[PDB]
Amino acid sequence: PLAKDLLHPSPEEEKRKHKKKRLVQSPNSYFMDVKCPGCYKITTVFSHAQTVVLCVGCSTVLCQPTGGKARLTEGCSFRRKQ
Amino acid sequence: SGALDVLQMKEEDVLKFLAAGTHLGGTNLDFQMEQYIYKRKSDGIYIINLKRTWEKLLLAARAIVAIENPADVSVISSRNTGQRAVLKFAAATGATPIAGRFTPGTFTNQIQAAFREPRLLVVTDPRADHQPLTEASYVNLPTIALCNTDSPLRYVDIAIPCNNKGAHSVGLMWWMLAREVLRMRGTISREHPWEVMPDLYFYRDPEEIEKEE
């Protein structure tokens, strides 16, 4: 305590903190590139998706809504964007 | 330390630290001791950064050497684990030891037989030596303490983080504090290894003495 630099927070404890309580608020979510097991072409998906994302180029269900992060279908791969 | 190579920790010192188990703290972390641990093993035990312990030891030695009267340093141990180490430290350096029970009022009551006015106080365990710690707060007495991961830091001015539970670790730190203050004073060279070896400072554990005889 006492002499603790609030100007230069450490990255680990900055991620440790709540998203709204950081020096500058940074959301915890991200955008994923989801690849279906059979379809050759990728889809952009929100991590905390609240809707049943359907394959635009097929009938496969890509993710299911949950309390927090959306659950990807088994086999459907994903890569973090940016 | 002061970034001086001649006052930097050596391989032999590190080996003695690890053999004695000084780096092994406890299962609880006091929030004022967090800047001394490295990380927490999956057994719940904290690991103490030995570099930082060496720096605090050197700072404590610098504070001790800064008193012209060697007999004006008071070295206190209440637990039997550190009594022999404290007596050996006093004999080696020149300090005044209090091994055993600390009678309250030793610092405040000037009529008492054991009344004394030290200029520096060194204790083995701030938890087990709380009475001299709080008594020092009445007579403007700076304090040096060997602190564990859960050791409270009230009235502690220079805290040397270590394991103050095991006999080997406590003896080793008292031995190296004596070595450091002697080397800084002028006696003993930093190249020749010290003749006195740390086992002389270890708690004898009477059931071990009986097997020894």
């Binding site: - | 080996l15 690890l18 690991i47 004999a91 740390p198 086992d199």
Partner: protein, 132 residues
């Protein structure tokens, strides 16, 4: 009740601390010593003091006593306490070390140590006493 009063006990302690060399395990020599070195106005008090001195001599024979403090005895006591083993207990050919403290030592720049033997870590994270 044969409980000695503080008069007897403090007198005996002072007598022992002052004249430990002259005393021994014999009551009948100790009482003469006490009557020679001290001024005890009663014979019964002298006998009680001598008896407690004999008891305390037997006690110091097999170790220390919280009341007595003999200056010459402390030198011999620390001489016994000066025991030094042939090989230091801290000098070990191989010392076991966890991966975490190995990483800490590597960060210390002491990662070239050879005596370290990296033991396997624990599996279950069960180090807490169950509550209830």
């Amino acid at each position: 009740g044969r409980v000695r009063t503080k008069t007897v006990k403090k007198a005996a302690r002072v007598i022992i601390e002052k004249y430990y060399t002259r005393l021994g395990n014999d009551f009948h020599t100790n009482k003469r010593v006490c009557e020679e070195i001290a001024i005890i106005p009663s014979k019964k008090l002298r006998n009680k003091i001598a008896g407690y001195v004999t008891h305390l001599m037997k006690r110091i024979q097999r170790g220390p006593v919280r009341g007595i403090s003999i200056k010459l005895q402390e030198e011999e006591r620390e001489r016994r306490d000066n025991y030094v083993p042939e090989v230091s207990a801290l000098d070990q050919e191989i010392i076991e070390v966890d991966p975490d403290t190995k990483e800490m030592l590597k960060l210390l720049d002491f990662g070239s140590l050879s005596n370290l033997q990296v033991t396997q870590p624990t599996v279950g994270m069960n180090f807490k006493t169950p509550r209830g």
